[PDB]
Symmetry: C3
Subunit: 259 residues, 3 copies
C-alpha cells in the first residue's frame, strides 16, 4: 500500500522516469502555444474543427502526463507467476515493496488522444460518419483492453489474451487508415498530405504493441525506465510532431478543407 507521495518521489529520484514524464509535459505545453499561434489565421468552421481536435491532443497529453507525474496514475503491481518481471521489487518510502512500478496512466493519455488523432485525420480525408464511428470505437476498445492487459495480475496467459484482443481492434483501425481513408482523401483533395500523416501514424502506431511486448509489461528485455522512454519518444512523434505536420499543412490550405 504505497503512497502517492512515495511514487511522486520515486519518479523524481529516477533518471529515466523523471525525464520521460517531465520532458513531455514541457513539450506538450510548448505545443498548445505553438498551435494556438499557428492557427489564428483560420476562419472556416470545418478547418477549425480539425484544428481544435488536433490541439486537444497536447491538452490531453499535458494533463495525463501530470497525472503520472503527481503519482496519481501510477501503481505498483505484482506480476503473475511465469511473468518475466514477477519477482521484481522497488525501494519505496522506507521499505522494499514487491512489484513493478506501473505507469498505467499512459493508457488514459492514449484513450483520450487517439480518438482526437483519428477525428482530425478522418475529417482531413473527408470520411463519412460510419468509418469515423468504426475507427474511434475500435480505437478506444484497443486502448482500454491494452490497459486491462497492463492491470491483470491474476495470470500471465490472461495478460497476453487481452493483448490479442487489443491487436484485433488495432487491425480494424489499420484497415480504415490504410484502405478506406487512403481512398477517401482523393475525393477530398488531401491525398498527398494524407499519405504522409498516415505513413507516420501507421509506422509509429505499430511501434506501441512491439514495445509493449518487449518492454516490462511483456517479456521485459526493456527495463521500466527504458520501457517508459520508448513510449515517451513514440508519443513526441505520433503526437506533437504529427500535430505540427498536420497543422503546418492546414494553415496553408484552409480552402481545401472548408465547406
Amino acid at each position: 500500500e504505497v503512497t502517492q507521495r512515495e511514487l511522486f518521489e520515486f519518479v523524481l529520484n529516477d533518471p529515466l522516469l523523471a525525464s520521460s514524464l517531465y520532458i513531455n509535459i514541457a513539450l506538450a505545453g510548448l505545443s498548445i502555444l505553438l498551435f494556438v499561434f499557428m492557427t489564428r489565421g483560420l476562419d472556416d468552421p470545418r478547418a477549425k474543427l480539425i484544428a481544435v481536435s488536433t490541439i486537444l491532443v497536447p491538452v490531453v497529453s499535458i494533463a495525463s502526463y501530470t497525472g503520472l507525474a503527481s503519482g496519481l496514475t501510477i501503481s505498483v503491481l505484482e506480476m503473475p507467476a511465469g511473468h518475466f518481471a514477477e519477482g521484481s521489487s522497488v525501494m519505496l518510502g522506507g521499505e522494499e515493496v514487491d512489484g513493478v512500478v506501473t505507469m498505467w496512466g499512459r493508457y488514459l493519455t492514449w484513450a483520450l488522444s487517439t480518438p482526437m488523432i483519428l477525428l482530425a485525420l478522418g475529417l482531413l480525408a473527408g470520411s463519412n460518419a460510419t468509418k469515423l464511428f468504426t475507427a474511434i470505437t475500435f480505437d478506444i476498445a484497443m486502448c482500454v483492453t491494452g490497459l486491462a492487459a497492463a492491470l491483470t495480475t491474476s495470470s500471465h496467459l490472461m495478460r497476453w489474451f487481452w493483448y490479442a484482443i487489443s491487436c484485433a481492434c488495432f487491425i480494424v483501425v489499420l484497415y480504415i487508415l490504410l484502405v478506406e481513408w487512403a481512398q477517401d482523401a482523393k475525393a477530398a483533395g488531401t491525398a498527398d498530405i494524407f499519405s504522409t500523416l498516415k505513413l507516420l501514424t501507421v509506422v509509429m502506431w505499430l511501434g506501441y504493441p512491439i514495445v509493449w511486448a518487449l518492454g516490462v509489461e511483456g517479456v521485459a528485455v526493456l527495463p521500466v525506465g527504458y520501457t517508459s522512454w520508448a513510449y515517451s519518444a513514440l508519443d513526441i512523434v505520433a503526437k506533437y510532431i504529427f500535430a505540427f505536420l498536420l497543422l503546418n499543412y492546414l494553415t496553408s490550405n484552409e480552402g481545401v478543407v472548408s465547406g
Copy 2:
C-alpha cells in the same frame, strides 16, 4: 487484501462462475466471426453503421467478460445490515473472507453494449436524433445507477433507492422502444422486423431487474453462481441471438435501411 489472482482461481474453481463466464467469452468470439462473415455484402454507409454498432455488441462482451474472468472487475463486498446476504463468507486464498464475490464488471458490459443495441434499433426504426439521444443517455444512467446499487455497502435502504432510480431510467427507454420507435418504424418501412426485435428486447430486458432483485444483489434467493448464470443466459439471448436476428434481416434488406445517418 483479496488479490485479483485469488478471485481468478475461485472462479476457475467454481462450476457456475467459470462456465457462466467462459461460455460467454466463447460465444462472443464465435458471434463476431459469424457476424463479420454475414455482413461482408454491405455497401451502404447507413446499413454499415447498423452493422458495426451490432458487431460492437459481442466485441464489448468478449472484452468485458474477460474483465470478469481475469478477476479484474470482481470485488468482495460485505453487505449492510438487514441485507439478506449480510454476513456471508467465501473461502479465498484458503482463508475465509467476509463478503460476497461481486462481479461488478457485469455493469461495465451492459453500459457498453446497451447503447450499441439502442443505436442499431433506433436506426432500424428511423429514429430522429432527439429520441436516439433520450434513449441512450437514460439507458447509460440506468446501468451506472445499477452499478452504484451493487457497490453500495453503507446501507441496505440506500441499495434499493439506487435500484428505484435505475428503474425510473429504464421506464424512459421502454417508452421510446414501445411507444415512439414502434410508430417510427412504420414510417421507416421496417415495422415488422422492428416489432419482433423490439419485443425480444423488451422481454429479455425486463429479465435483468428481476434477476437483480431475486439474486445475490437483491434478496439472494439465487446464490452467486446462480445469479451469474441467470445474467449470462439473458446475455446470450439479448446480445448474441438478438444480434444474429438483426443482422439476418439487414443483410437481406440492405435497400430498406440505405441512406444518410
Copy 3:
C-alpha cells in the same frame, strides 16, 4: 481503511453535511418532476432535445449526490505538507482519523452535468457543431483536472498546478460563452434569453474556482461543512434555477428554436 458506512454516517450525523447533500437530492428529484411537467407540451424535435438535455441536469444531480450521500464517492484524504489542512483529522468509525473527508463525487456531478449545460445553451444560441465541440471538450477537461487537483495528495504544489491547468481550460470555455455564443444568439432570435442565462452561468461558474481556492481543498478557511455548502449553493443556482429559467423560455418560445 475508512468504510463506506462510516462516511454515510459521518455525513448523516453532521448538520451542515446532511443538509448540503440531502437538500440537493430532494431538489433535483423535484426539479425532474417539475421539468417533465413543464415540457409535456413540446412537439418540435429541437426543442425536445433542449428539454431532455436540461432535464438530464437534475437526473445526473439526483444520482451523483446520492453517490456522495452513500459514501460511495467520498474519500478521506491526508493533505500534503504545506497544505493549510495538512495534519487535519476527523473521527470516523469512532476513531480519530488523519485527513479530510473529501467529497470527490462532486466532480462526477459536474463532469456529467456541465456538458449538458453547454449543449442546451449552445443549441439555444444557434451554435455550429465546432464551437459546441470546443465548449464541451474543454469543459470536461476543466472538470477532470479539477477532480485530479482534489485527488492529489503527493505535494501541495502539484495540486494548485492542476488547478491552473483547469483554469486554462476554463478560459477557453469562457471565451465561447461570453463572446462567440453571444454573437451566434443575436441571429437565432434568442439574444435576449441568451444574455440572462449566460450572465447567471458566467457568474455562478466563476465561483467554483474561488470556492475551491478558499474551501478545504484550497486554503481551508471554509472547513468541510462550509466547503460543501459553498459548492452546493452554486449548484442549486447553476443547475436547478438555471434549468427552470431555461425551460421557462423554452415552454414559451418553442417555435423560435425549432428553426423551421
